[PDB]
Amino acid sequence: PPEGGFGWVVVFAATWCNGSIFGIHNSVGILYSMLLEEEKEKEFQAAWVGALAMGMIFFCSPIVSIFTDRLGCRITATAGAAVAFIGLHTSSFTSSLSLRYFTYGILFGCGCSFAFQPSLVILGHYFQRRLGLANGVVSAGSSIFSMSFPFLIRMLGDKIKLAQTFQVLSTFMFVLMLLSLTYRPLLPSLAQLRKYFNMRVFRQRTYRIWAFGIAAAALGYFVPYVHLMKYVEEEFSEIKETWVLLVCIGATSGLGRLVSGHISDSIPGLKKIYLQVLSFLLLGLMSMMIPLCRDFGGLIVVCLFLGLCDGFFITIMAPIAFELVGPMQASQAIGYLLGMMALPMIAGPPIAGLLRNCFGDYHVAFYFAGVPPIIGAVILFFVPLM
């Protein structure tokens, strides 16, 4: 492992992936608004496709792993980038409703998953000892890029039209393909289903319990951002532009990603899991103490803490997987962990909204968002004892 050098170049490519994928998805809602402007001059489906894209990313990793194991990081990443580019291109072309849904959701999500998992796998390939620092740098850069995307996307959208926006996103995907072409391998590479789906990583019950804890904790991850924005917009009004929450969340999340990437490098072994546990607990608390402040003063601090803990957890995830299962079978571990997190991630916000509708208040929604992090914290705390 070079521990740097050309690895840094790979890191750049890795960044250009998270950033792009996740930024083109954080902007999905904006696109729909533009579609509404084009819906006239001649139903509630935006959320369905918006969640379908990310859900497809997560659901298709259990398989992207099969490939990256067999084919390799470069081939899988390039194929995913190509599929994403074609999805965006065909979305630009077609002017319809069902075909747009199929194209965007299926093609873009599948390509995004294929281009996303090999990035983490190759990052592990190169450093293997400073993996914490590399993951922190990648997370911080990707966060900055993803935040930056909506501004330009909305300005272009207000400028001309939707198809041009899809063209711009497609060229972004093309540049991602070109960069992903740099994942130079550095490590050795009826019964067909039994060899493609060996599920050998699911032995070593420490990984099993770790994955269970992460999956349980992910059930309350996507609530306290979208629901927090909708709740501050609806309740806690009479405030000026309410942008402080978003900006502080982003800044502290980036700083926490960098800091956690750096510090995780120091802890010897499975003690790294403790870094998650702590953060997990905080997350839960930082949710349960969101609606207890009558003024925005407490909201600023709670949002700062929320973003810091989010960055901690996000950047910490992958190095722990590589330490747990080793480098040879880290791709399978990452893929199956993402697949397991797939369902709670999409099931969280819907449950929060359903509870809000049933009770009419966001209190229960935020409490139920905060509890699963604590449950996962307990499970992960028990993990390293063996």
Ligand X SMILES: CCCCCCCCCCCCCCCCCC(=O)OC[C@H](COP(=O)([O-])OCC[N+](C)(C)C)OC(=O)CCCCCCCCCCCCCCCCC
Ligand Y SMILES: N[C@@H](Cc1cc(I)c(Oc2ccc(O)c(I)c2)c(I)c1)C(=O)O
What residue 337 binds from ligand X, a second copy, ligand Y, none (CB within 5 to 8 A, per partner kind)? ligand Y
What residue 92 binds from a second copy, ligand Y, ligand X, none (CB within 5 to 8 A, per partner kind)? a second copy
In terms of CB distance, is 174 or 236 closer to a second copy?
A: 174
Backbone angles phi, psi at 90, to 5 degrees: -65, -30
- What tokens were used for 127? 């450093």
Tell me which residue has tokens 């960055």: 311
User: Are 372 and 301 contacting, i.e. CB atoms less than 8 angstroms apart?
Assistant: no
83 binds ligand X (CB under 6 A): yes
Site for ligand Y in 95-134 (CB under 6 A): 120
Beta carbon of residue 137, minimum distance to ligand Y (angstroms, whole number): 13
Q: CA separation (Å) from 349 to 40, 218, 226, 242? A: 30, 11, 8, 21
Q: Which residue, among 135, 130, 116, has the nearest Cα to 11 in the 3D structure?
A: 135
74 binds ligand X (CB under 6 A): yes
Beta carbon of residue 182, minimum distance to a second copy (angstroms, whole number): 13
Select the residue interacting with ligand Y from 133, 324, 334, 355 (CB under 6 A). 334
Site for ligand X in 179-238 (CB under 6 A): 181
In terms of CB distance, is 78 or 329 closer to ligand X?
A: 78
Question: Which of the stretches 75-83, 104-112, 170-178, 314-322 binds ligand Y when contact is defined by CB under 6 A?
Answer: 314-322
What residue 75 binds from ligand Y, ligand X, a second copy, none (CB within 5 to 8 A, per partner kind)? ligand X
Give CA torsion, residues 99, 227, 142, 173, to 10 deg.
Answer: 10
Query: Which of left, alpha, beta for 237 (phi over 0: left; psi -120 to 50: alpha)?
Result: beta
Backbone angles phi, psi at 186, to 5 degrees: -135, -5
Q: Tell me how many residues contact ligand Y (CB under 6 A).
A: 12
Select the residue interacting with ligand Y from 314, 324, 340, 379 (CB under 6 A). 314
Using DSSP's 3-state secondary structure scheme, residue 127 falls into coil
Q: How far apart are CA 332 and CA 199, in angstroms?
A: 8
List of residues contacting a second copy (CB under 8 A): 82, 85-86, 89, 92-93, 164, 167, 171, 174, 178
Question: Which of the stretches 151-159, 165-173, 282-290, 312-320 binds ligand Y when contact is defined by CB under 6 A?
Answer: 312-320
Beta carbon of residue 6, minimum distance to ligand X (angstroms, whole number): 13
DSSP code of residue 136 = H
